[PDB]
Design a protein around this ligand. Sequence first.
Ligand code: CA
Ligand code: CA
Ligand code: MG
Lengths: 146, 735
Amino acid sequence: QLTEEQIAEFKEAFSLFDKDGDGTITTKELGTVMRSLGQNPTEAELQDMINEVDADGNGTIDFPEFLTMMARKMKDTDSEEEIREAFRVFDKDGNGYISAAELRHVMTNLGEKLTDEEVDQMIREADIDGDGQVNYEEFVQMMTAK
Amino acid sequence: NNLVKTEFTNETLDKIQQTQDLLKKIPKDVLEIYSELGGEIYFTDIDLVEHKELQDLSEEEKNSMNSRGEKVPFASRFVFEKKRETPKLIINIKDYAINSEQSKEVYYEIGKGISLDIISKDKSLDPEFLNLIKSLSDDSDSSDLLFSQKFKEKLELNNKSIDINFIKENLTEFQHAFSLAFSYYFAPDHRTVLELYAPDMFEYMNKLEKGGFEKISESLKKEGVEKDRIDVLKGEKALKASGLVPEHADAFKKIARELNTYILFRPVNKLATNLIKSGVATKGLNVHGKSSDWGPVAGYIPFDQDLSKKHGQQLAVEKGNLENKKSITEHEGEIGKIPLKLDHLRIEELKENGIILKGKKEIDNGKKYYLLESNNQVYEFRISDENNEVQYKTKEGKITVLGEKFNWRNIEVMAKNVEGVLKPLTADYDLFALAPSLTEIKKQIPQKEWDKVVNTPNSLEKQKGVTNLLIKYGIERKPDSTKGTLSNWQKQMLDRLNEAVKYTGYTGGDVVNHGTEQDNEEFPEKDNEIFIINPEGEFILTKNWEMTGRFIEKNITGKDYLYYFNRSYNKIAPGNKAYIEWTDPITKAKINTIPTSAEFIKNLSSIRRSSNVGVYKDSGDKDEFAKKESVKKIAGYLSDYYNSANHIFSQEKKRKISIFRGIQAYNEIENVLKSKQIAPEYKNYFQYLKERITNQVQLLLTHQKSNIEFKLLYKQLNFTENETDNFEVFQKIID
Ligand SMILES: [Ca+2]
Ligand SMILES: [Ca+2]
Ligand SMILES: [Mg+2]
């Protein structure tokens, strides 16, 4: 049972992406909603979803057919927190930023041996904006995005 | 801390290639002592006089005793040690000249000496017998009464053997010695003039170079930390406000070591510290009754709430009782009530502590009742003789707030099943937190998994694979039917915590019942004084909510121990609707981060349910839709910002394309911000939602080519109809 704070969001989820004006959205755009809300769900996984909870022909979704469909994926990926704490863990110094120094400095303690060459390879690939350090946002992506 | 500061690199090497010469001469450690005493050495240009940025009025010539010999013509000086607090040695050089006559450089040493010396050993620890005895090369030990180098105008007093009878008096005098000695043992030229004449001071400065200089350089290094430090109270001085029971804390001591993890406890009211040692079990989850600190029942969860702290609070007590009743109703056979039986010792304790007074006695239906007295004004108390049950009633001239009036009854208290026997209840050990070393969590993962993870090709998958492991086997907390909400290891620790205070002499069950207050997301509390027990066994009690924070950041967070904080900390805990505060790194780095798609959409959603006016209304005004359409556009640039493909580009590019993507978003915000009447609340937001973009791009910029300022770079752009060349432009703009 998604809280209300948890609902007002999914509201301005449809709301924003609706150039038709009912409170009903299509496939192409149901994706767009979640994606922006924060998920990369396979163009394959959207099919049976919209294919089961709405064989109503149309190929759309009233807020209900959504408010529900969502209070489904809102369970195991409840990692939003675990993940934000993994983050604070590596951020060994408090600068809100993870640096290869600390990446290595902890990858090691957990018994992992990393090459000064490889840590600078993770960080890099994990940094989206170039500063040369992963931030929570960059981190959150790195983690969840499969 | 860099010891030497060369002010003017004015001359060529010659100046430099002289200062260097000067230093390498002086003993590497002498410096490490100087830098340790927070000193700094100044080599400036021709500022001879009072011109040094640090040569003005602080602590100057008050009593003239300056060089080796005594002159004092300041103006004619090229070396000076700023006496008072930090040692600040300042020097300078003119043309090429220290070489030929070293009778000049010899002052950069005494001129130095005054530095360490007085806190070097002469009077470093105190006059240490080592230097106190060495200062006796006056004319006793050696047939060498030849010290006409340092003892002329101050020690022609060969007629007064020097020791604790005198040496104090003119310490400074005995400094000039440590100086001209140091100057001599080190002067570039005369090294033996010391070794020749004074036969000990040589073997002294000499021992100093042996390691004597590494000595103080280490009694100071260590002092370095413990001096300026986190004011706590390690040792039995805290274990006293710790409330814990010494045999227990001391018991816990074995665990923090074996497993190496910080153990933090909240305050266990003093009043039940002994009630514990005494075998009284502890309140767990099942009970929610209130404790109490006055009268006989003290430290127990009096079935009667008007007999606990909240004495008077009608509704608190009215609901207080309401809670024990259910405590039993729902968890029967395990929770209930049993008569209060103050044992032997306990009675003598509630006396020196002043909780109760034992006086007049009396005879009722054949039994001896001492009569326990307490200054309460509605309840009188008496304790049997046969057994020590306790009793109270309403004084013939008072009543019970809830509107009750009763005659002599036994004081019932709460108690739980333990080896099948309802034992009275009292304060338990509520852990504030558990910090196992990061390396211990490792020993929590099953080799086959952590194995099957690192043997991965994907470096970035490797990290994940790891983090999840670290998350799973170490950060994750599940809710339990018994122990509140906690981690599996947290649990195991919980058991070892108890079986620890059981193989000692506890016969009341467990003393640590639930998980760490860090999961008390519902009704989180804020205690000033927190008891910790490092992986070393030292006891510690913070004093502030901050100190605790500060501590944990220095010895836990900052160090290599895994820790996490009450998800409710900077937020607003529902249950008690309380707001705590705990420094969160992520947040401290928000002012500089373009928000995400969802963080935005989220924020909007917030205000929408706060005012009842959204960024855009469900109407026909084509100026509304203009807006809606427009936020959907912001929720793109921002979403475009954080793109994963961003890897297929080189670092520098990333910064750039991102900086643009940013400006992108920013702009369109500026846009709406200039639209129709968008509620003044979103007005602010969108504005702060700029501050960030701004700040963020500044970063991404001063990260590579930082001459341009966000303000500027923006002006130079053309966000009219054509975007194409706009970027092509922007590029050069940063080149
Ligand atoms: Ca960091
Ligand atoms: Ca970054
Ligand atoms: Mg408790």
